[PDB]
């Protein structure tokens, strides 16, 4: 399948070269997989989600996304126009309030929730969790991310936006999850992207168009935007049977475009997520 005039990040993940604008992908499109977006919520009524999104948990007085960040990330995972895996099921877990803030205790509870809740959901092709959030190092936060991964969920986490080594951030620094840095449309490391040996992969993160609250769209930047590209890619590859939740991060690294990014610090992987789709 081909989506013409796609957002640059979708085109990038299906291309061996920067500078193209069509997204190519197998029409299975993540059908039968599920992606949990652990964030500020998801505006599930957005036409772009086509009934495939739903809120399943909140820790606040409402399950509504009053911020937009979670809706944007969910859109990059799985919206019809802006999403990598256009037929996946999206589940919202609101661990962040409408200012984008959340206590580590709440974030941990949300991860443990997903590890159990996937057993209440029909996801025969596999389960992914996208965590576009984090803060300073916490062994308890890292352990929660490790538990979620061990339970059989592909966990993709944002590296962070401090232009610093991700070893000092959580859950970014948990080795067993998939830690995602950000790149731009010219194949440069995004100016704000964290780096370091704990990174597994880069995805598009500068100037990413996706869904927003109020039934709208906008372009924003962050490792938060790169992470759902990788989460959606994992769901897509799991639906194709090419990999599993336990192996998808390694598979994405194995099949990535290698050596193509600039301003990668020595010791950080030079790997850009790539779907390897051949029509
Ligand atoms: C106008 C705008 O509104 C935003 N809300 C959340 N974010 C994401 C930053 C923090 N996040 C965890 C809540 C934005 N980057 C953003 C931008 C730009
Ligand atoms: C380790 C980590 O530390 C963070 N601090 C703020 N944010 C919010 C910035 C979100 N983005 C859209 C600009 C994070 N997403 C984050 C992550 C991951």
Query: What atom of ligand 1 comes closest to residue 100's alpha carbon?
Result: 13
Separation CA 99–CA 188 (nearest Å): 30
Residues 175, 150 contacting (CB under 8 angstroms): no
| CB 220 near ligand 1, within 6 Å | yes
CA of 250 to the centre of ligand 2 (A): 23
Query: Is 69 labeled as catalytic in the residue annotation?
Result: yes
Q: Which ligand is nearest to the CA of 205?
A: 2
Whether the CB of 240 sits within 6 Å of ligand 1: no
8 Å CB contact between 131 and 155: yes
CB-based contact 262:188 (threshold 8 Å): yes
For this entry, resolution in Å reads 1.2
Is 95 among the annotated ligand-binding positions?
A: no
Residues 208 and 9: beta-carbon distance below 8 Å: yes
**Is the CB of residue 206 below 6 angstroms from any atom belonging to ligand 2?**
no
What backbone phi and psi angles, to 5 degrees, belong to 49? -90, -15
| Distance from C-alpha of 56 to C-alpha of 138, rounded to nearest angstrom | 26
Identify the CATH number of the domain defined by range 2-272: 3.40.50.200
d(CA 158, CA 168): 13
- Per the annotation, does 97 bind a ligand? no
Beta strands in 31-139 (DSSP E): 33-39, 53-58, 89-94, 126-131, 135-136
Alpha-carbon distance values, 273 to 10, 56, 68, 144, 204 (Å): 10, 29, 25, 25, 8
Task: Decide if 39 is catalytic.
Answer: yes
Nearest C-alpha neighbor of 144 from the set 250, 38, 70: 38
Look at ligand 1, atom 12, and give the residue with the nearest C-alpha. 100
3-state secondary structure of 169: strand
160 lines ligand 2 (CB under 6 A): yes
Ligand nearest to the CA of 39: 1
Q: Is 46 exposed, middle or buried (0-12, 13-18, 19+ CB in 10 A)?
A: buried
Strands 216-220 and 208-212: antiparallel
Please state the domain extents for the chain: 2-272
Residue identifier of the C-alpha nearest atom 11 of ligand 2:
222
Q: Which residues contact 261 (CB under 8 A, 6 or more apart)?
A: 183, 187, 188, 189, 202, 270, 272
Q: How many helices (H) and strands (E) does the chain have?
A: 6, 15
Angle at 14 between CA 9 and CA 20, to 5 degrees: 65
Longest Cα separation, the chain: 47
Catalytic residue among 14, 33, 39, 132: 39
Instruction: Report the distance separating Cα 121 and Cα 16, nearest Å.
Output: 35
Give dist(CA 147, CA 142) in Å, integer.
Answer: 9
Q: How many other C-beta atoms are found inside a 10 Å radius of the C-beta of residue 133?
A: 28
Burial 194-203 (b: 16+ CB within 10 A, else e): bbbebbbbbb
Q: Which two structure tokens, joined as six digits, stand for 163?
A: 């232009």
* Chain CA centroid to CA 72, Å: 11
What are the two backbone dihedrals, phi and then psi, of residue 277, each rounded to the nearest 5 degrees?
-80, 130
The answer to whether the CB of 135 is under 6 A from ligand 2 is yes
Instruction: Return the CA Rg of the chain.
Output: 16
Q: Please name the residue whose Cα sits nearest to atom 13 of ligand 2.
A: 222
Taking alpha carbons only, the member of 241, 246, 273, 236 closest to residue 26 is: 236
Q: Could you tell me the distance, in angstroms and rounded to a whole number, from the CA of residue 254 to the centre of ligand 1?
A: 32
Sign, Cα dihedral of 216, 219, 225, 230 = positive
26 is in an annotated binding site: no
């Amino acid at each position: 399948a081909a989506q013409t005039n796609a957002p640059w990040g979708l085109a990038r993940i299906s291309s061996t070269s920067p500078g193209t604008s069509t997204y190519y992908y197998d029409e299975s499109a993540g059908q039968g997989s599920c992606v949990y977006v652990i964030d500020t919520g998801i505006e599930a009524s957005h036409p772009e989600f086509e009934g495939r999104a739903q809120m399943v948990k909140t820790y606040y007085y409402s399950s509504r996304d009053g911020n937009g960040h979670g809706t944007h990330c969910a859109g990059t995972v799985g919206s019809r126009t802006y999403g990598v895996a256009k037929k996946t099921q999206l589940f919202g877990v609101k661990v962040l309030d409408d200012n984008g803030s959340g206590q580590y205790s709440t974030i941990i509870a949300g991860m443990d929730f997903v590890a159990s809740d996937k057993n209440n959901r029909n996801c025969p092709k596999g389960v992914v969790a996208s965590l576009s959030l984090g803060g300073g190092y916490s062994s308890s936060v890292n352990s929660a991310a490790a538990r979620l991964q061990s339970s059989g969920v592909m966990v993709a986490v944002a590296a962070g936006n401090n232009n610093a080594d991700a070893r000092n951030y959580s859950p970014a620094s948990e080795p067993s999850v998939c830690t995602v840095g950000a790149s731009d449309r010219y194949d440069r490391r995004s100016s704000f992207s964290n780096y370091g040996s704990v990174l597994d992969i880069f995805g598009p993160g500068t100037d990413i168009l996706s869904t927003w609250i109020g039934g709208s769209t906008r372009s924003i930047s962050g490792t938060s935007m790169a992470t759902p590209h990788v989460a959606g890619l994992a769901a897509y590859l799991m639906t194709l049977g090419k990999t599993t939740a336990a192996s998808a991060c390694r598979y994405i690294a194995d099949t990535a475009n290698k050596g193509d990014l600039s301003n990668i610090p020595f010791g950080t992987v030079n790997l850009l997520a790539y779907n390897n789709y051949q029509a």
